[PDB]
Design a protein around this motif. Structure first.
Motif: not given
Length: 124
Positions: A57, A60, A75, A105
Motif C-alpha cells: 500500500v 499505491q 489501497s 480500502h
C-alpha cells in the motif's frame, strides 16, 4: 525498543484469519496485542491481508493524512478489516469491544528505508 514498523504489525496486522474470527475477536485481540495494558484503547483496526499486501500500500494511492502530512497511501483494492470499538459497559482493566467486520480500502502512513507502514490512518 519497539520500531514503528513493529508497533504497526502488533497494533494492526492479523493475517492469521480472513475475517473477524467471532463476536469475541476484539476482546481477545485487543488484550493479546497489549492495547489494554495502561488503558482501554478506545478504537483499533486489524487488517486480514498478508504483510506483503499491506506493505505494498506504501506504493499505491498517495492521499493526505488526517494530521495534514502527505505520506499516507490508500489501497487500490478493498481489504478485509476488523474494527474494534470500546463499549459503554467497558471499564479498565476489563476492556470490552464490539467486533465489526468490513471490506474497505485502508489508508496507512509510511516512513523509512525500507518504506513501510507505521500508522493506520483510516478506512474508506
Amino acid at each position: 525498543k519497539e520500531t514503528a514498523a513493529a508497533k504497526f504489525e502488533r497494533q494492526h496486522m492479523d493475517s492469521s484469519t480472513s475475517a473477524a474470527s467471532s463476536s469475541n475477536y476484539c476482546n481477545q485481540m485487543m488484550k493479546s496485542r497489549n492495547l489494554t495494558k495502561d488503558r482501554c484503547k478506545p478504537v483499533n483496526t486489524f487488517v486480514h491481508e498478508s504483510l506483503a499486501d499491506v506493505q505494498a500500500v506504501c506504493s499505491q494511492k498517495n492521499v493526505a493524512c488526517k494530521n495534514g502530512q502527505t505520506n499516507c497511501y490508500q489501497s487500490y483494492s478493498t481489504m478485509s478489516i476488523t474494527d474494534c470499538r470500546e463499549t459503554g459497559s467497558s471499564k479498565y482493566p476489563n476492556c470490552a469491544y464490539k467486533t465489526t467486520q468490513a471490506n474497505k480500502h485502508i489508508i496507512v502512513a509510511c516512513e523509512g528505508n525500507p518504506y513501510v507502514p507505521v500508522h493506520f490512518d483510516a478506512s474508506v
